[PDB]
Amino acid sequence: DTVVVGSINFTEGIIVANMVAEMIEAHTDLKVVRKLNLGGENVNFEAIKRGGANNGIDIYVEYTGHGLVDILGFPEPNVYITADKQKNGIKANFKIRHNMEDGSVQLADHYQQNTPIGDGPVLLPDNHYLSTQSVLSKDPNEKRDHMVLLEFVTAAGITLGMDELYMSKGEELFTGVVPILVELDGGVNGHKFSVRGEGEGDATNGKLTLKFICTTGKLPVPWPTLVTTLVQCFSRYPDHMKQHDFFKSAMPEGYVQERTISFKDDGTYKTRAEVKFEGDTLVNRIELKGIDFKEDGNILGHKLEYNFPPPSSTDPEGAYETVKKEYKRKWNIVWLKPLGFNNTYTLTVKDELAKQYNLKTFSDLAKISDKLILGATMFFLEGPDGYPGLQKLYNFKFKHTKSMDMGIRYTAIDNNEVQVIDAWATDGLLVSHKLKILEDDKAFFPPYYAAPIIRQDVLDKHPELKDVLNKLANQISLEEMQKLNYKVDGEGQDPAKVAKEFLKEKGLILQ
Incomplete structure (x- = not known):
């Protein structure tokens, strides 16, 4: 039949949309409808959700960075840390997007303050972030309500800049592997519960392994909501950032982590914890109070899946892989091979x-x-x-x-x-x-590699599309794409003409 190809109203998008249309019309006997959207928010994402049947698009060119935004909420999951000199500690913002069964998302907005327990000197950091990966599992031989957590945390956001480096005395306590005890006493809407976790942490690698058990019976809330609350001193800081690791500098006396977690359209957790050494063991002792929760809500109703969202990687290949996998698993959309340019x-x-x-x-x-x-x-x-x-x-x-x-x-x-x-x-x-x-030295920006995106059902109906579109793989470099954008904007030309000319020039379209 026919396939709908959409694009936003900007030069590069129109050019590549016409390129895809020409590839389909040349290498397949299929009809290509071309649609240019209004420019509304997530217009292409929602259009490809609807499909051609419900007045939507079936194919469009997306960029990995906007893909990270659309399926992971790119900026939000990163733990953004700034300094509060008044309280001699740090503050942090982030949001967690808990997956639900129906593909929806429960938002959890985290505001965090950290304050040293002792009176010793502590490192106050420049603005940076913690990238966190969390994997939740179960012990098959554990009859209690429990959670197995494996976590990797790396600090980022500070540039290595051709200047000499080599920091604190608490830093030396994390050279090896440290045992970890976590105790949580909580109450949510009058449910009183406790959680005990044991494990270990390798801060030189940024790796935490922990097993949590609910010592009081059935946990009255889903386990992923307690993940954040249940030791950021084990984050792996690269050698050039080691002067900004507040959490290790406060050891052994420890620090106090107060946090407010707001669940959208539901209640809130308020946590206060002390993270400190006791003998050889790093302990995290937490009091949690959840106040305003809907009894049939997502949290008290246990409507959250036992997973954590995958991390948003700044690496170009890692970004493409994560975006492809998540667009597939959720909403069933195929990321095809990248065209080869990064339009950042x-x-x-x-x-x-x-x-x-x-x-x-x-x-x-x-x-x-x-x-x-x-x-x-x-x-x-x-x-x-x-x-x-x-x-x-x-x-x-x-x-x-x-x-x-x-x-x-x-x-x-x-x-x-x-x-x-x-x-x-x-x-x-x-x-x-x-x-x-100018140079993005803190490296906030994600990759913006352009690649074609197709609905899986349209791929099923017409399996040839995968190879014909993947023919445009690594074909358009940044220089070539810039030349075509100039040949449209600098010299007034029809985008379809430039697209067909470029396709024939490289032999992609024979005629």
């Missing part, structure tokens, strides 16, 4: 500006942001992977922020209307306006 957000300035203020990286731009006016697309300003996520890590304080269309932002930076723009790495106008891209 990047803050860019006039090269004159960078020369004058000696700007190399995002941190330098941040220290003078108050003087500057940022002009960016609505996608960068609104999207969680754009300016808001950036500020979670970078502390940008711009004088103004003006939403602009693509193209108009380039003329505006040329005319000094704005000083910083959200240039996209494949933008055609990047050659002509003499701009400098």
Whole structure:
């Protein structure tokens, strides 16, 4: 029959949409409907959910970063740590997305304060984040209500910058493997329960193995809700970040971790815990009080699956794999092979500006942001992977922020209307306006490798599509894609003509 191919109203998307349409019409005897969307939020994601039957798309080109946003909530799962000098400790924000049976998600918003127990000196960190991977399992020979947890945590967000390095005396307590005891006394909506966990931690590798048992009978809440609450001192800090490990510096006297966990459309947990050494053993002693929970709700009704969401990886291959697997497992959508270019957000300035203020990286731009006016697309300003996520890590304080269309932002930076723009790495106008891209030194941004995305049922009806579309694999480099975007924007041309020309040129389309 026919297949619907959608795209948002931007140059690169239209070009690649026409390329896919031409590949399908050339290498298969199938009909290709082309649809250009309004530009609404998650328009392509919801369209490919609906499919062609319900006035939606069946195929579109997505970027791994926006995929991380769409199926994992990319910025949110990272534990974003900043310093509170007043309380001589740290604060942290994150959100957990607990999977449910019907594919929905229970949101759990975590606000966290950590304060040293002793009066010793402690390391106050620069803005950074903890990337966490958690795997939940069961012992088959354990008749009690229990959870087996295996966890890997790595600290990120601080750049290695060709400067010498080598930090604290509590750091030396984690050189080897440390035994771990965790005690939790909790009450949720009047249920009183206790949890005891035993295990061990290797901080040089960032690995925790623990087994928790509910000593009071049946646990009145699903186990994944207690995962966060149930030892961030075991996080593996890379050698260049070892000066920012607050948690180890507070040892052995320990620290106090207070946390507020808000379950969307349900109750809240309030936890206070003390994490400290007792003899050889690191102990986490927690009091948990949950107040306002719906009795038939997702939490008290046990409507959450026994899993934790997979982590969002900044590695390009890891990102593609995670996005492909999750789009498959949830909503049943196939990520095909990448086209080969990475069209990433990047803050860019006039090269004159960078020369004058000696700007190399995002941190330098941040220290003078108050003087500057940022002009960016609505996608960068609104999207969680754009300016808001950036500020979670970078502390940008711009004088103004003006939403602009693509193209108009380039003329505006040329005319000094704005000083910083959200240039996209494949933008055609990047050659002509003499701009400098700055470096994402804290490495907030994810990969934005473009790849075609197809519904599984359309793949079933027409199995040939997989190979014909995968023919465009590693074919379009960043330079080539930029050349085509310039051949549309810099020189007014029809996108379909440029697409067909490029396809015939490389022999992908014979004629």
